Amino acid sequence: DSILLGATTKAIVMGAGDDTVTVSSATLGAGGSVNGGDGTDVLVANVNGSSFSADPAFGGFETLRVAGAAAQGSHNANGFTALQLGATAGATTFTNVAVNVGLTVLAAPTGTTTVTLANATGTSDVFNLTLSSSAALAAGTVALAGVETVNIAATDTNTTAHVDTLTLQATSAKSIVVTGNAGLNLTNTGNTAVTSFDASAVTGTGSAVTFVSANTTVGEVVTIRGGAGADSLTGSATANDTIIGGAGADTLVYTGGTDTFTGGTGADIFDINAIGTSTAFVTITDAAVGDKLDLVGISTNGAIADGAFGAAVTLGAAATLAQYLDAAAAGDGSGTSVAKWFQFGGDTYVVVDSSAGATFVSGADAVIKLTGLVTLTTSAFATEVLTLA
Ligand SMILES: [Ca+2]
Ligand SMILES: [Ca+2]
Ligand SMILES: [Ca+2]
Ligand SMILES: [Ca+2]
Ligand SMILES: [Ca+2]
Ligand SMILES: [Ca+2]
Ligand SMILES: [Ca+2]
Ligand SMILES: [Ca+2]
Ligand SMILES: [Ca+2]
Ligand SMILES: [Ca+2]
Ligand SMILES: [Ca+2]
Ligand SMILES: [Ca+2]
């Protein structure tokens, strides 16, 4: 059953089953009560602040939802087992939130949604955020200070695919796990403790996940996992990122350091935006027919080949990696950068020469490793984009 109440004078009962009362005023009147009865019942606060647990006038409720044209401000979560959020008048804050209590956002709110837990002090703090809508949902900013694992469910209620959006502010989260069946473009700015982003369980044709690590710990191991969608995963220059797309047209971005890329099934694009060193470079584990290698961001001097540029550099039975690099960079890349490639020790390498001498210079010349023997003979350069043939 489901009603709206104001400053009621009478004893409202809701009976069994999953009921819903929306209140327009925080305290009742005369006397002046509302009992949710048996089952999981939602109380909707269309008000400037609440403390329903304290008032014995309200009883039998399990879920607190902040939604309505007057819904706003500070709300005492105490004694609720779940939380919900809808459209709001202004910034709304949940205080005294017990452990294993999750928030479900159901519609775009107004202003930053702050969650502050009963006790944030431990180092194993878990929060369950849910996004649940038929259409694309702009969840806005939710702040979760002191939480270490943030779980996000992105849920689509209908059969037709969409992508939700969220700014998360979770400055001590080490893990973010995304589940669900809709896409999530997640704004991640300033969430610098994050070393594991796992959206791998996500499900549709295009439940597309976007993520960019804000991590700046020098020499960190960061793990970034995409889902079934056409995902857009960027690491950190600071970090040794392991990035893995799922199914679908994934874009994996290189920024610096020792990175390990695996675009799974589908036409993946490995977008190389940094030069790297001779030790800190990107290894692409599963480069296959259809995958692309976007070298626009290493065209230091001009813009790459543009041909089908495809005869492997060949050296002797025991030529060294150092030798093959120097050999590949032999030409002049001062006015115009050039691509070459070779196969050493069972793996395939691609080079960009941006220099004078026949030394591969660690700084401005670039190497990219590809696990296995992959023949790039027949494969062609689009703009500065190599499509594997
Ligand atoms: Ca009930
Ligand atoms: Ca109560
Ligand atoms: Ca109940
Ligand atoms: Ca939908
Ligand atoms: Ca904590
Ligand atoms: Ca946090
Ligand atoms: Ca994917
Ligand atoms: Ca990196
Ligand atoms: Ca993929
Ligand atoms: Ca692929
Ligand atoms: Ca690029
Ligand atoms: Ca050179």
Side-chain angles (χ1 to χ4, degrees), residues 188 194-195 197 210-217 220-225 232-244 251-261 271 273-274 282:
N188 200 45
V194 187
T195 72
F197 178 73
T210 301
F211 181 87
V212 176
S213 201
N215 195 303
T216 56
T217 326
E220 254 295 12
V221 154
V222 173
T223 308
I224 308 168
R225 241 92 80 103
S232 176
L233 316 171
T234 297
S236 343
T238 222
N240 290 356
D241 310 279
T242 304
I243 309 180
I244 291 141
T251 300
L252 281 64
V253 192
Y254 183 63
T255 32
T258 306
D259 286 1
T260 302
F261 286 6
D271 187 350
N273 280 337
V282 48

Side-chain angles (χ1 to χ4, degrees), residues 226-229 231 245-248 250:
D231 313 301
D250 301 301

